[PDB]
């Protein structure tokens, strides 16, 4: 586990539920708590909240698990990066998970949609046109997101694909300081320099896509995107990491997830499968040599780097808080 600086601990293996559609979202996190999950990654939106709190209502009434022992994450969604809307929307995150809290609410993007519609997560206009809310003011932000820690709506609060000047920002006007940042990383993106940024601050830096994306490339083309070239690297056929895995007689996954881990990193690998998301969890069991963690180390691409750019449409780069034009 690692622990916030309000002193909340956060278990350092969690399930990432994007993408899982509820009809396999709710048996896999069946599997995952079975397994020794106790810390679940979701989002507004994924569109899995309603499934995880079904399968969570069953855990909680029946089984032998109680809610003080797992650890919920969801998000705001792009669509209201508005200090107005922010108890609206974590207010519909909760009653889809029918919880009366979350352990850790996120503001999922510095960049801000025009509210639409409640269920409209990607808007667009009378043409086809993107619709981006340019106004986006973070520090106005940010406070609707403390106003929930005192509703005793969330535990805590943090951020997701914010850059160091943005967090520099938040933090420096902050009366909650982020409990957490929620950014891409891997051994191929290890975000060395935004981890040590975070930790200069006690901010734990969640990784998602630790064992780099493979659906994804995939899902950028299922929608109107274009797959970069950094997708074309699975860092689980990287030879490096082979060659560590039969050293450990471990698989390339939970090699990759020891990597962030030890770096006191929250990882959230997302499987649909009972067997991967039991094979993500088998990870507590081994060491990495400081000699591996070099070679680890070796792999790291930084800057593109990215598989989760943010740069599909004109008006998103454009956008005043596009956070990957900054070095970290
Ligand atoms: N902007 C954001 O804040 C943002 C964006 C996207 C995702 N996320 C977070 O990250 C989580 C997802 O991360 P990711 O799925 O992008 O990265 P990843 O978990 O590293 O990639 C997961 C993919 O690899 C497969 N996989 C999972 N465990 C495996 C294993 N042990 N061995 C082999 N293959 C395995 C899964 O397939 P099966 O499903 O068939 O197992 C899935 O397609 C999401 O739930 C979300 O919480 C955050």
């Known amino acids: ?70 650890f919920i994450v969801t998000k705001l969604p792009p669509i209201g990066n508005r200090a107005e809307s922010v108890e609206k929307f974590l207010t519909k995150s909760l009653e889809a998970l029918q919880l009366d809290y979350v352990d850790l609410y996120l503001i999922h993007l510095p960049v801000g949609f025009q509210y639409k519609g409640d269920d409209n997560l990607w808007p667009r206009g009378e043409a086809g046109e993107f619709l981006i809310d340019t106004s986006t003011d973070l520090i106005s932000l940010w406070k609707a997101m403390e106003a929930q820690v005192d509703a005793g ?18 933090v420096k006007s902050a009366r909650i300081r982020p409990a957490n940042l929620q950014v891409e990383l891997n051994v191929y993106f290890q975000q060395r320099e935004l981890v040590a940024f975070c930790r200069a601050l006690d901010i734990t830096v969640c990784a998602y896509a630790p064992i780099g994306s493979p659906g994804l490339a995939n899902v950028i083309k299922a929608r109107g995107a274009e797959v970069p070239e950094s997708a074309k690297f699975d860092p689980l056929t990287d030879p490096v990491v082979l060659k560590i895995a039969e050293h450990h007689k471990k ?48 792999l790291d691409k930084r800057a593109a ?24």
């Open 1 to 70: 586990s690692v622990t916030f600086h309000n002193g909340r601990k956060m278990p350092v293996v969690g399930l990432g539920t994007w993408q899982s559609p509820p009809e396999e979202v709710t048996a896999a996190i069946d599997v995952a708590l079975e397994v020794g999950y106790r810390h679940i990654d979701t989002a507004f939106m994924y569109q899995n909240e309603a499934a995880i709190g079904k399968t969570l209502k069953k855990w909680f009434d029946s089984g032998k698990l109680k809610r003080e022992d797992v």
């Open 153 to 170: 709506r969330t535990r805590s609060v943090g951020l997701s694909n914010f850059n160091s000047r943005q967090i520099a920002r938040i």
């Open 251 to 298: 698989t390339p996954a939970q090699v990759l997830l020891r990597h962030c881990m030890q770096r006191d990193i929250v990882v959230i690998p997302k499987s649909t499968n009972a067997g991967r998301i039991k094979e993500n969890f088998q990870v507590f069991d081994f060491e990495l040599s400081k000699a591996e963690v070099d070679e680890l180390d070796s």
């Open 305 to 328: 780097g990215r598989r989760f750019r943010m740069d599909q449409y004109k008006g998103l780069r454009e956008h005043p808080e596009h956070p990957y034009d900054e070095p970290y």
